Point group: C2
Chain length 24, copies 2
């Protein structure tokens, strides 16, 4: 699940095996 509150991004991408998360 992705949460888009304000002008910030709090989503987590975990698929295949590699984990990529951007909190900017």
């Amino acid at each position: 699940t992705a949460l888009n509150t304000x002008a910030v991004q709090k989503w987590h991408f975990v698929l295949x095996g590699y984990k990529c998360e951007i909190l900017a």
Copy 2:
């Protein structure tokens, strides 16, 4: 502190505003 090479490792890369890390 390196990419999964033979034994058990993990590549660490962080540049700009993105934090992505691989795990083997």
